[PDB]
Design a protein around this ligand. Structure first.
Ligand SMILES: [Zn+2]
Ligand SMILES: [Zn+2]
Lengths: 135, 220, 97, 25, 86, 54
């Protein structure tokens, strides 16, 4: 329609300068819709680069103590007899029940992790669910 | 006619005239598998402040700024179709090419999930005829096609001064998109959400046009 | 009062932990008279061929069992700035339900 | 509120495989 | 532009130039704002700021394009390679 | 020869849904036959669950 230079920058400033000039005697409708509700970042053209040297990605990860608890559970026992149902948003599997029992027993006041682990194991064994572990 | 232009600029003063806040929920976006992403090696460069964190080499797209940029994009596409706009769904993907084309036919829109040739929207003077009204809005539900390369329609849109509201994931180039929003676009149950939200936006833009046609028709 | 961290802290994908030898249930959504595309959940889905036993039993909407390996499963090459994505999970099938 | 991600030791890491004669002379 | 005949090449150049336009901000429509010292390939171009009481001590093509834009008072300096397109 | 009719009016909106893609009738027929194929697949699935010319 107007200027065909997309490598300069955003289209808003280019259209504004083109209308302000005098060659295009027509105010676009999308321009009005844009200036009526401005977003948060102008769509400027930035040439991508490649990281080198000590430049890394400043993106932190997500870890908690429940991850370590589940790791220890999988290292000791393994996979449970119940199948994970990803269709249910609030699906309480064996690992979730195990970590909930672990944290509700830790909220009491003990310092030894092996005692808490064996207590949670005996509790889940005497409750009703029988985890068919390996020999 | 000044009355025809004054009635169109009236809802622009409202921060949310179409009321696009109750269309989604903070909990509904979690059940639709939106915060999911690819691995850590396929992550694009321009995709760092849009990721909350990683979960075993799996980036998690934060839904805080996602819903912020989503409402600014739905409101932009609402006023376009309200003033007799033309949208176009350009998403070259061989998985949901049937659902996208039917939603534009039931609502009277335009879709394009086929192969993109060359002189379509750019060389429209020697292909479709003399003067052809180019679409002033292109919706990119799937920016990357079936070859993992930025499509040419987003590059030619900024050439002819045409905005583009696309759905960028984590391996695209959200630079020429005027209204980007980080979100997954590869899950089966997720793409059905964005395709339905765009359908509800038509039911509040062109169907709501009749509410203002009776105000000007009282005089003649 | 619900924020963002509490939504994914109790998410099943964060409760399962690693995706290595995990019993997961899936459904069937599309059959190409040869493959059984199992959609157990997540971003991608699993793929598997028709077994010799119970061929007619597995139809559209059959709940089976999977071992659940890598969700995306990608790997970079020699002279490649980025790695490709196969959009497949490939999990070993166990039994019925 | 207190559910923020904490960068710790990164679990889910099994002991690396050693040689068949590393523990012997 | 690039063609075989002179008139056809001129027509193609005009048709390709009428679609490629830019915009340059000017101070009082005679001289640019601040001084810029940039380079392109092997063409080191450098210009300064001159008031209304000054001529045009720039290159022939530079003076031509600045008159086409609207610049009437400017002093530039080029060094290195002597290329038109660059 | 059969002249190509005009698909756009005074407003500028084309009369066909799949017009901004070069081929319109061919892609419409492709969409129709794909819809017929998926309808036949659904009918075959329902039947399995509820058990000269050129
Ligand atoms: Zn894509
Ligand atoms: Zn050794």
């Amino acid at each position: 329609a107007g200027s065909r230079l997309e490598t300069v920058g955003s289209i808003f400033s280019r259209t504004r300068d083109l209308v302000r000039a005098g060659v295009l005697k027509e105010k676009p409708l999308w321009f009005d819709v844009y200036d009526a509700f401005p977003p948060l970042r102008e769509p400027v053209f930035q040439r991508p680069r490649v990281r080198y040297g000590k430049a890394k990605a400043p993106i932190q990860d997500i870890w908690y103590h429940e991850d370590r608890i589940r790791a220890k559970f999988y290292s000791v026992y393994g996979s449970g007899q119940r199948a994970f149902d990803l269709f249910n948003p609030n699906f309480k599997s064996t690992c979730q029940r195990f970590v909930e029992k672990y944290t509700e027993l830790q909220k009491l006041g003990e310092t030894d992790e092996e005692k808490l682990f064996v207590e949670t194991g005996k509790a889940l064994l005497a409750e009703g669910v029988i985890l068919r572990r390996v020999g | 006619t000044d009355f025809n232009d004054k009635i169109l600029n009236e809802p622009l003063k409202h921060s949310d005239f179409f009321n696009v806040k109750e269309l989604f929920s903070v909990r509904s976006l979690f059940d639709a598998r939106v915060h999911l992403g690819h691995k850590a090696g396929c992550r694009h460069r321009f995709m760092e402040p849009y990721i909350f964190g990683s979960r075993l080499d799996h980036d998690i797209i934060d839904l805080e700024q996602t819903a912020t940029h989503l409402q600014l994009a739905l409101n932009f596409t609402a006023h376009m179709a309200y003033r007799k706009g033309i949208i176009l769904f350009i998403s070259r993907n061989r998985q949901f090419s049937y659902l996208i084309e039917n939603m534009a036919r039931d609502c009277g829109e335009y879709a394009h999930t086929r192969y993109f040739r060359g002189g379509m929207l750019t060389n429209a003077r020697l292909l479709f005829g003399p003067t052809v009204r180019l679409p002033d809005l292109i919706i990119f539900l799937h920016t990357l096609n079936n070859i993992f390369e930025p499509h040419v329609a987003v590059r030619d849109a900024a050439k002819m001064n045409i905005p583009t509201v696309g759905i960028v994931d984590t391996n695209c180039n959200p630079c020429l998109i005027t209204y980007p929003v980080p979100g997954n676009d590869d899950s089966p149950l997720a793409v059905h959400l964005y395709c339905r939200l765009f359908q509800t936006a038509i039911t509040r833009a062109k169907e709501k046009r009749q509410q203002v046609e009776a105000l000007y028709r009282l005089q003649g | 009062v619900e924020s963002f961290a509490s939504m994914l802290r109790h998410s099943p994908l964060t409760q399962m932990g690693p995706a290595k030898d995990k019993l997961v249930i899936g459904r069937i959504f599309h059959i190409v008279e040869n493959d059984l595309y199992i959609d157990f959940g997540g971003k991608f889905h699993c793929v598997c061929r028709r077994p010799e036993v119970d061929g007619e039993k597995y139809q559209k909407g059959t709940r089976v069992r999977l071992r659940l390996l890598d969700l995306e499963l990608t790997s970079r090459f020699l002279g490649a700035t980025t790695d490709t994505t196969v959009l497949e999970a490939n999990a070993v099938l166990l039994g019925i339900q | 509120n207190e559910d923020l991600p904490i960068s710790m030791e990164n679990p889910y890491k099994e002991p690396l495989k050693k040689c068949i004669l590393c523990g012997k002379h | 532009g690039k063609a075989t005949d002179r008139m056809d090449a001129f027509r193609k150049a005009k048709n390709r130039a009428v679609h490629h336009l830019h915009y340059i901000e000017r101070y009082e429509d005679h001289t640019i704002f601040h001084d810029i010292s940039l380079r392109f390939k092997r063409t080191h171009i450098k210009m300064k700021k001159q008031p209304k009481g000054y001529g045009l001590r720039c290159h022939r093509a530079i003076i031509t394009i600045c008159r086409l834009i609207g610049i009437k008072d400017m002093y530039a300096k080029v060094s290195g390679s002597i290329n038109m397109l660059s | 020869p059969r002249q190509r009719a005009i698909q756009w009016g005074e407003d500028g909106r084309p009369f066909h849904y799949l017009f901004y893609t070069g081929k319109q009738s061919y892609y419409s027929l492709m969409h129709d036959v794909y819809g017929m194929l998926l309808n036949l697949e659904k009918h075959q699935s329902h039947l399995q669950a509820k058990s000269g010319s050129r």
